[PDB]
Amino acid sequence: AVQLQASGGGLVQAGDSLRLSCAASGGTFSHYAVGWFRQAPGKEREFVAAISWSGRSTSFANSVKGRFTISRDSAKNTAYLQMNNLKPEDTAVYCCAPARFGTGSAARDEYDDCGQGTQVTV
Amino acid sequence: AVQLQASGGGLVQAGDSLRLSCAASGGTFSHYAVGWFRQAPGKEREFVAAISWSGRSTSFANSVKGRFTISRDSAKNTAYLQMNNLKPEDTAVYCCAPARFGTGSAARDEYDDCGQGTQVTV
Amino acid sequence: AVQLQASGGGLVQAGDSLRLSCAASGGTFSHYAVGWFRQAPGKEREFVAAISWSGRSTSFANSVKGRFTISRDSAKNTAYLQMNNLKPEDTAVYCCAPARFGTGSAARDEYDDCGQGTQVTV
Amino acid sequence: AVQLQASGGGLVQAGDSLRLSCAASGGTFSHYAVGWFRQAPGKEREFVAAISWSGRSTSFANSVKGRFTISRDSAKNTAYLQMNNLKPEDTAVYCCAPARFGTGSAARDEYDDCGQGTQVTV
Amino acid sequence: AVQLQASGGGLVQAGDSLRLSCAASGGTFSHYAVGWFRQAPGKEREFVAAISWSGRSTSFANSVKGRFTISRDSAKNTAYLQMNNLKPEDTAVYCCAPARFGTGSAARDEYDDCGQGTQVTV
Amino acid sequence: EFQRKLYKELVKNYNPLERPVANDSQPLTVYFSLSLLQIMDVDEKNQVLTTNIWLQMSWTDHYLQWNVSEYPGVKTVRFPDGQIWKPDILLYNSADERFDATFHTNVLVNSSGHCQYLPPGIFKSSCYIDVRWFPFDVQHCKLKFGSWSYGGWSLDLQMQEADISGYIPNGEWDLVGIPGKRSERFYECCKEPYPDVTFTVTMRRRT
Amino acid sequence: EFQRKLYKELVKNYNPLERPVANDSQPLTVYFSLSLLQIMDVDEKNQVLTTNIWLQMSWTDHYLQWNVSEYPGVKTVRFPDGQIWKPDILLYNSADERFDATFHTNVLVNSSGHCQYLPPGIFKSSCYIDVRWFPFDVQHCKLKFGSWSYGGWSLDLQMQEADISGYIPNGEWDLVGIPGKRSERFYECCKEPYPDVTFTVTMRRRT
Amino acid sequence: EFQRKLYKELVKNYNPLERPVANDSQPLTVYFSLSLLQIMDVDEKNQVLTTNIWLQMSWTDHYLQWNVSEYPGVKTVRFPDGQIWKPDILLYNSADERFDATFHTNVLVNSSGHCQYLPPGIFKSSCYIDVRWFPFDVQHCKLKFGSWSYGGWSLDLQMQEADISGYIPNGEWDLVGIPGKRSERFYECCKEPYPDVTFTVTMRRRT
Amino acid sequence: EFQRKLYKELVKNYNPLERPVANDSQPLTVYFSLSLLQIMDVDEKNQVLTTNIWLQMSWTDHYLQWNVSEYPGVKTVRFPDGQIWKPDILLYNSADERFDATFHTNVLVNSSGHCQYLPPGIFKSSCYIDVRWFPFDVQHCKLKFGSWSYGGWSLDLQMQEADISGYIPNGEWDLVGIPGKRSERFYECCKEPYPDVTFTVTMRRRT
Amino acid sequence: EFQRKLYKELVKNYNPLERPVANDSQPLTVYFSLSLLQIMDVDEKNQVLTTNIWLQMSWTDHYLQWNVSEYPGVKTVRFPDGQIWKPDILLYNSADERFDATFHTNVLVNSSGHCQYLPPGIFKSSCYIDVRWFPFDVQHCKLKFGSWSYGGWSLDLQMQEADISGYIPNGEWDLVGIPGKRSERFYECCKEPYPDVTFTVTMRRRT
Ligand SMILES: *[C@@H]1O[C@H](CO)[C@@H](O[C@@H]2O[C@H](CO)[C@@H](O)[C@H](O)[C@H]2NC(C)=O)[C@H](O)[C@H]1NC(C)=O
Ligand SMILES: *[C@@H]1O[C@H](CO)[C@@H](O[C@@H]2O[C@H](CO)[C@@H](O)[C@H](O)[C@H]2NC(C)=O)[C@H](O)[C@H]1NC(C)=O
Ligand SMILES: *[C@@H]1O[C@H](CO)[C@@H](O[C@@H]2O[C@H](CO)[C@@H](O)[C@H](O)[C@H]2NC(C)=O)[C@H](O)[C@H]1NC(C)=O
Ligand SMILES: *[C@@H]1O[C@H](CO)[C@@H](O[C@@H]2O[C@H](CO)[C@@H](O)[C@H](O)[C@H]2NC(C)=O)[C@H](O)[C@H]1NC(C)=O
Ligand SMILES: *[C@@H]1O[C@H](CO)[C@@H](O[C@@H]2O[C@H](CO)[C@@H](O)[C@H](O)[C@H]2NC(C)=O)[C@H](O)[C@H]1NC(C)=O
Ligand SMILES: *[C@@H]1O[C@H](CO)[C@@H](O)[C@H](O)[C@H]1NC(C)=O
Ligand SMILES: *[C@@H]1O[C@H](CO)[C@@H](O)[C@H](O)[C@H]1NC(C)=O
Ligand SMILES: *[C@@H]1O[C@H](CO)[C@@H](O)[C@H](O)[C@H]1NC(C)=O
Ligand SMILES: *[C@@H]1O[C@H](CO)[C@@H](O)[C@H](O)[C@H]1NC(C)=O
Ligand SMILES: *[C@@H]1O[C@H](CO)[C@@H](O)[C@H](O)[C@H]1NC(C)=O
Ligand SMILES: *[C@@H]1O[C@H](CO)[C@@H](O)[C@H](O)[C@H]1NC(C)=O
Ligand SMILES: *[C@@H]1O[C@H](CO)[C@@H](O)[C@H](O)[C@H]1NC(C)=O
Ligand SMILES: *[C@@H]1O[C@H](CO)[C@@H](O)[C@H](O)[C@H]1NC(C)=O
Ligand SMILES: *[C@@H]1O[C@H](CO)[C@@H](O)[C@H](O)[C@H]1NC(C)=O
Ligand SMILES: *[C@@H]1O[C@H](CO)[C@@H](O)[C@H](O)[C@H]1NC(C)=O
């Protein structure tokens, strides 16, 4: 919803589970798809996971296909990225971006700018 | 107003306050929205705060949501970015950009080119 | 087909052959052209090979013109990049990009975003 | 005029004056505005000064507002950037770019590509 | 002609001459203009020389104006960049790009993608 | 400015080609009605009825919605032709050369996403005028309206009673009334049922 | 050049879809007036009045403003149709097939943002022409103008007296004057009030 | 939403200029048929037949296909004029000033790529009306349709029987049937053969 | 290719909305002239004159200039409507429904920037025809041309004598000459004076 | 797909504004011819000839060429109006209100770059009709075609004999033949000579 902020990042050990939160502010959360992205210290920004505005469509990167899950909750205006056993290359800063009535796809052109992300270190 | 110039930077200690000024030249200041950006030498340019052409709409990045305030003053053709307690993460060069009758949003396509920013160090 | 994932990378010696697999998921594989790209540690992303949606048109970079071959198999929804004698210049991460009914050309605008590639080292 | 070439760069001490020349070739000089840009060893290209095709409009960066002047002379098909007391911050390679009947503004979407600039060091 | 490949690079001493070749494949060579570009180890790609599809128009960068010549030969589907006395600043990787019925200009939007260039060192 | 912000935000990812439903499996309900302003010409020789009509289409977009608190002072927006999805309702029995005789105006959308499209037009429809009872003939002129490319599985066309509160009486013909009926017909082109709304003009020759 | 610079600066962030008000909670005042050049034809059989008319619409954009000292020599700019916001004033009682019979010309804007729009056109409007008094009948022909999609909450339509100095006398019909009045009507389509201005041509058949 | 995803995916790399075949060496088969709704006017003086006709064109794109499981609820899409390839079927013996008298509607495409297109129109075609047997003349009015820029090597125009289920009887003319025939003709413009389908209206004057 | 290079170069930074002067403080001089090919119809009942006319507009752009040595073989370029600035000359006393009855052709520009524009058209202008002297009436038909949105402060409209060499004699009406005059009128719309040129057809009824 | 690849390659750097020559110093040769299908009417009162004609323009682009081995199965391409350069041939003696009465179809280009363009249209042209020998008059109707903005230095217009094989007999008028001639005329507008081709219909009234 216009402004999306990520939270819940921290330092974990390999194989541990981490839940990332994305809170909405500045609009109606149910009108926007939520897309998650990573940026490594020296790498480019990459897609991770997405959920559609209705939650019926989800997309995942292949590395996180079986390990990350995405969920929505309109009551708290929050999108949750659940993370099962994490691995060294999951260490990066995660940003959350809105897509106005998006389809929950990996296409970057349908998303707005990310907020200020949260660092996850494994 | 066409040309916006930032000023008022310097070196401060953590938790201190700092006021940044943006003077207009080359046009009518009341016809332009003012946006603030950080360069963060090792990072990319990021949105900080914005004020609409009428001053009725403001946008803030989440990191500076409760600590930075933005204001306009047409008598001196100036936009003021007031900064409460600062953090080492705020050390960067701040640039000021105009947007013709902008809404005070965080969209980069709405703003003109930034001037030559001023460095603040915390 | 919407989502393309490369696999089969590893470490090889100069002059050795290597086959790279590219699995499709999320759509009809026969409706998409598959384009192969490299990225070296320090370098820009470069075209390598391509195959049209029907397999009747193929494109190759000049360095890999006589050494790399490309093939399709709709039964397993896979695109195979066969590699004859390799050279130290082939050490890079290879990625797959779909192109909806593409002509198997080297034009980047025709292709979708690459997935998460696989590293090969010579 | 289609092709603009900068010249006259060199090494100077702080507080000295320096004149940069920009010769035209490949077209009519009076049909083009002349823009000056600074590259810097590690920074991005930034606008410095501009003069309209008729010489009636000039734009300057705020750092060089009171120190740099710009002038045109159609007899020699040349544009001159005069520089008063220079500062260590004015150490960079300067490029000269044409704008077809440009207004002498700082907008980048109006100029053509620069030539091969000349280095000045203070 | 669709695919252009550079060749003939190597190591030379200052003041020596060098001929670079550009072979065409994948189309009609007479329908395409040929543009030459340098990449350099740490700099951006820069225009060097160009020839029109008919060979009646040529463009050169100022640094190589009086030292580099460009020619076409439709018999061998080749474009030749002759290089008179070479200088250390010419040490770079040269790429060759086609432009469909191009005018032999320096405009980048008119050319296609370069192939894999050849390194010359002075 | 909040109008600028809302106009920028609404068109994000918006595709005018897409039917604006939230499920893609249930039809979009489009309410259709008429406003007869004038019966302009009843051509007995050419068998053509010429009327001045304002069509009324109402639907829900579900993609153009906003919170009035976040956009103060902006309760409605207007979109021109080709910028948002519109129903392709056409006059089946059109005698006009251009077939679609309506004038495209703005679509009015409010914060809940309700789109109101009120096209004015001069419509030429085919009517059989019986001159057998010459002085006292009651004529029934059908105006059949429906979507051309959307069936009842995609566009549920519902009927609302026509408005004659702005009717300017004719000199030669008296308006008995304009009843409407909604039907669903199968055409030889297609296996999809096609709903339509037919309004019967039902005039009487004046003494 | 200053004109080029001004056009580039003015088109920045401008949305033609947005009503150009500084405060979205306030109606935009649009002054509307007429300029009758000649009465082309009075069709007694078809109940249609044909006139040559220049409409006059004036409003304030507040988005197209500049300082003449900052843009020397540039006091006015001209914008074509579809590049800036225009009122959708239409002839309600239009007898024309295209309904909108006006010719779209440039909108003229001066430094303070005042946009003026003077579209010429041959207007065909429905008129009830009585032949009961035949030789010396006075005929009142109504020309009703108003915004189609903007109500009184968004577009406040003010009326100005019709211009007559450019009128050329007709052969068969004598003009006694064209008074105009502004009303605010309610329609069955929405609860939104709609202001309109009506000019009565009020001709007399010449001896 | 799956409609948005499907439209975005379908418009990828799509060129409306390109004939949507999978081989480029075999012709695209386009099935053409007619739907007569009304013989509106038989102008004996001007030798022009005016008819209300819905054309029917069917072909396969092979570029607009999707899996309904991957796009649940989306079984059909609709594309406007100029967004996808359409056959350039024209009425050769057209008496209309605009020549192409058809109204461009949406093209309907289903999951297997079958595009189906029903342009309605009022068609004016040249017809030799012979008044030798004034009350008992049987008149054969030819309606010749074919692609203008595509020959038989590129567009294989197949013929389907015309539809008379929706025909509305005329007042002065009986419809005895509309036989259609497909023939390939050669023109002096090029060596390219051009297929065409001709429907003969074959009316009879009523008593 | 030099013509390709010139077309690429000329449109750089070019704004068709901008009046192509070099100072912005002095008016652009536009030379306007007529070319009467034939008087197609003189309608005494409708008081409308129908003529076939080629307009001639000439001006200087100062933005479309090049060196013929730098572009060998390219002495002229041609620009379609909407790609470069054109004067908005209109027929004030136009009796046509679309008002602007001219056909938009290419604007021809030569190396010094001289743009020349020759739109042909069938012009319908209002004319008062006196039937007093039935076989010996000399009729003065006025054709008034001028810029609609540009006044004398911005567009200085100069007059050139009408071309007659291409005239073909009419059957019923004899042409005695078409003199033109340039005036500068004031309108109630604004304080801006507007120059105009009026050509009087001045026909004579043939025996 | 080879057709898709060919279209993408052909549209590269292409400017429709540019005359497609290889030297810019020699004229582009455009071959023009007629195909008379039928004479719709011969208006003696309005002095207007109404005919159905397919124009035929042939030229060489030199920018749309390809090797059929590199694009197997793709021997021709078709380009719509506004996507490639076309000659601006117009009917000088046009009596139509729109002047250009032709219907814009696709331009057909083959591998060697030969573009061929066959626009159909109903043409209304001014003709002098003599009723002196009322039942035995031979009427010479002139049809003058030429480029409007290209002279002989840029566009060399060559003439080809008109096509009659598709003509259908007229009821009242017999076609004795349509000879064409090519001339080069000078106009007062510029020193540029303008070639034109004129076809004379040369009808005879039937007994
Ligand atoms: C937007 O307009 C719609 C329709 O005018 C309003 O919907 C209401 O509820 C039903 C839903 O279709 C309509 O039939 C009613 O006529 C509408 N009004 C009432 C009082 O029920 C909707 O409330 C409007 N939204 C806003 C925010 O004003
Ligand atoms: C621009 O033009 C307008 C209207 O011509 C001028 O507006 C003034 O105030 C009202 C409208 O608010 C007009 O009716 C008056 O006629 C104008 N006052 C005058 C002419 O004294 C406005 O001043 C103009 N702005 C300029 C010329 O900068
Ligand atoms: C899409 O529509 C086409 C035509 O309506 C279907 O094609 C089938 O095969 C021919 C047409 O080539 C018809 O005679 C059949 O009646 C069509 N239907 C069936 C069931 O065979 C095609 O199957 C449709 N594709 C879908 C619905 O996915
Ligand atoms: C371009 O055309 C113009 C007008 O056709 C030429 O202008 C000359 O000066 C006036 C018009 O301002 C005419 O009376 C002259 O006859 C024009 N020609 C000459 C030779 O004086 C202008 O010279 C042309 N520019 C070219 C050909 O480069
Ligand atoms: C493309 O078409 C042209 C013309 O149709 C072919 O060139 C010849 O053109 C002349 C006159 O222009 C004709 O009389 C000849 O019949 C044409 N053909 C030959 C073989 O001479 C040209 O060959 C065609 N290119 C192809 C088919 O690749
Ligand atoms: C969509 O409609 C189908 C049937 O029409 C229904 O089964 C499904 O639950 C609907 N989806 C939602 C999200 O309500
Ligand atoms: C609109 O916003 C207000 C405050 O921002 C909030 O209380 C209200 O719930 C919002 N409306 C909806 C429908 O979410
Ligand atoms: C806008 O208008 C509303 C009502 O007209 C008023 O209450 C409000 O104060 C106005 N806002 C401004 C900034 O003038
Ligand atoms: C216009 O500019 C001048 C000087 O640049 C200034 O004095 C004047 O106040 C400006 N006008 C407005 C309305 O700000
Ligand atoms: C295309 O058609 C040609 C002949 O029409 C045939 O030889 C060829 O096999 C076809 N291509 C495919 C892929 O079927
Ligand atoms: C459609 O998808 C389903 C499951 O995703 C698959 O079983 C089926 O084969 C697909 N259809 C086609 C034609 O590939
Ligand atoms: C522009 O015109 C004004 C007055 O018309 C004049 O004072 C000024 O000198 C002109 N500018 C140039 C550059 O000639
Ligand atoms: C055109 O170019 C030639 C040589 O390039 C030069 O001598 C001449 O002065 C130029 N013309 C103008 C008007 O500058
Ligand atoms: C172009 O034409 C001119 C004369 O028309 C001729 O002198 C010149 O050689 C031609 N150029 C080419 C490349 O053939
Ligand atoms: C077309 O291509 C074939 C083989 O690729 C080649 O032999 C032939 O010369 C080419 N045609 C032309 C005109 O270059």
Author numbering:
A (entry chain F), B (entry chain J), C (entry chain G), D (entry chain I), E (entry chain H): 1 to 122
F (entry chain A), G (entry chain E), H (entry chain B), I (entry chain D), J (entry chain C): 1 to 207
Publication excerpt:
The human α7 nicotinic receptor is a pentameric channel mediating cellular and neuronal communication. To develop a novel class of α7 ligands, we recently generated two nanobodies named E3 and C4, acting as positive allosteric modulator and silent allosteric ligand, respectively. E3 and C4 bind to a common epitope involving two subunits at the apex of the receptor. In this study, we solved five structures of the α7-nAChR in complex with two nanobodies, unraveling a common epitope at the apex of the receptor, which is formed by the MIR and the N-terminal helices from two adjacent subunits.
We then solved the structure of α7∆ICDcryo with a 50-fold excess of the E3 nanobody, with and without 100 µM nicotine, with an overall resolution of 2.6 and 2.8 Å in the ECD/nanobody region, respectively, and low signal in the TMD. Five E3 molecules are bound in a similar arrangement to the one seen for C4. Surprisingly, the conformation of the α7 ECD in the E3-Apo structure also matches best the agonist-bound conformations, including Loop C capping and Cys-loop outward motion. At the orthosteric site, the conformations of all binding determinants resemble the ones seen in the E3-Nic structure. In the cavity, we found a well-defined small spherical density, which is located where the electropositive pyrrolidine ammonium would be. The density would be compatible with water, or more likely, a cation such as Na+ that may contribute, along with the binding of E3, to compact the orthosteric site in the absence of nicotine. Yet, Cα rmsd calculations show that E3-Apo slightly differs from both E3-Nic and C4-Nic, with locally 1–2 Å deviations in the loop C, as well as the top and bottom regions of the ECD. In conclusion, our data point to a striking effect of E3, which, in the cryo-EM conditions (high 50 µM E3 concentration, 1 h equilibration period before freezing in the grids), stabilizes by itself an agonist-bound conformation of the ECD through long-range allosteric interactions at the top of the receptor. In addition, E3 shows a unique interaction between the Arg56CDR2 guanidinium and both the main chain carbonyl and the first glycan grafted on α7Asn23 (pre-β1), an interaction absent in C4 that harbors an alanine in place of the arginine at this position. In addition, we show that E3 alone stabilizes a conformation of the ECD that is characteristic of agonist-bound structures.
